[PDB]
Amino acid sequence: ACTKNAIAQTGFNKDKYFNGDVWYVTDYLDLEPDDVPKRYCAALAAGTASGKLKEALYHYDPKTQDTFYDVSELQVESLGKYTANFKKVDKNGNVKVAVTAGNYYTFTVMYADDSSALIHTCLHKGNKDLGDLYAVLNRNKDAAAGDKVKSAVSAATLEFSKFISTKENNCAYDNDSLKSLLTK
Ligand code: HEM
Ligand SMILES: [N]
Numbered sequence: 001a002c003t004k005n006a007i008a009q010t011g012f013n014k015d016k017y018f019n020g021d022v023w024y025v026t027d028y029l030d031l032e033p034d035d036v037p038k039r040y041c042a043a044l045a046a047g048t049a050s051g052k053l054k055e056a057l058y059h060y061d062p063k064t065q066d067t068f069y070d071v072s073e074l075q076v077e078s079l080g081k082y083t084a085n086f087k088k089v090d091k092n093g094n095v096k097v098a099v100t101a102g103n104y105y106t107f108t109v110m111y112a113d114d115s116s117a118l119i120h121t122c123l124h125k126g127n128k129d130l131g132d133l134y135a136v137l138n139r140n141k142d143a144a145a146g147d148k149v150k151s152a153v154s155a156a157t158l159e160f161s162k163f164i165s166t167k168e169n170n171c172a173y174d175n176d177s178l179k180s181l182l183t184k
Pocket of ligand 1: 025028030036037040041042044057059068069070086087088097104105107119121123125128133135
């Protein structure tokens with residue numbers, strides 16, 4: 001279960017974040033580990049498409065090769081805090097698993113600048129028990145976390161040294177698909 005009420009960035013600039021570009025997850029912190037994907041790859045595109053706030057997600061397990069894309073319409077709770085009902089799709093946007101009540105994630109932008117961000121997400125999917133997940137994002141897939149985002153990690157009362165890096169996984173992304181999915 002999730003336990004954090006993440007605080008959104010003071011002065012969060014929604015148009016800059018939701019500009020249609022891609023964000024790569026460089027480091028993550030899951031508060032309920034299991035025995036994971038200690039090795040994982042993820043990226044997202046965020047933007048407004050035909051007046052609707054959307055996000056397109058990509059997940060890839062670099063060891064098992066398990067891959068999936070999602071598209072979500074985001075609903076606003078408050079500045080920088082959203083609720084997203086996702087639909088699993090192929091890379092071209094064809095639906096594989098339709099939107100279902102009960103299958104959603106919350107998303108909070110705790111910090112963001114033009115190149116980096118810190119987010120919190122709480123996933124709800126059917127029957128699985130899931131916990132809070134924090135992610136450090138960058139516009140450059142290979143960027144080491146800079147002082148602005150690491151300071152935000154500290155301000156959230158988290159230890160950046162506990163975050164797991166995604167950089168040693170040889171991850172390659174289909175950026176074109178992520179961007180096109182925003183319209184689906
Ligand atoms: C912006 C960051 C992220 C968001 C918004 C997000 C969102 C989601 C959503 C919506 C699903 C369900 C998709 C579906 O069933 O169609 C999912 C599944 C999953 N995510 Fe993420 N995720 C993010 C980052 C990550 C990262 C970094 C990891 C690495 C630990 C991760 C691990 C997983 C796994 C293992 C599942 C499969 C859950 C299952 O079905 O039991 N995610 N994620
Ligand atoms: N996730």
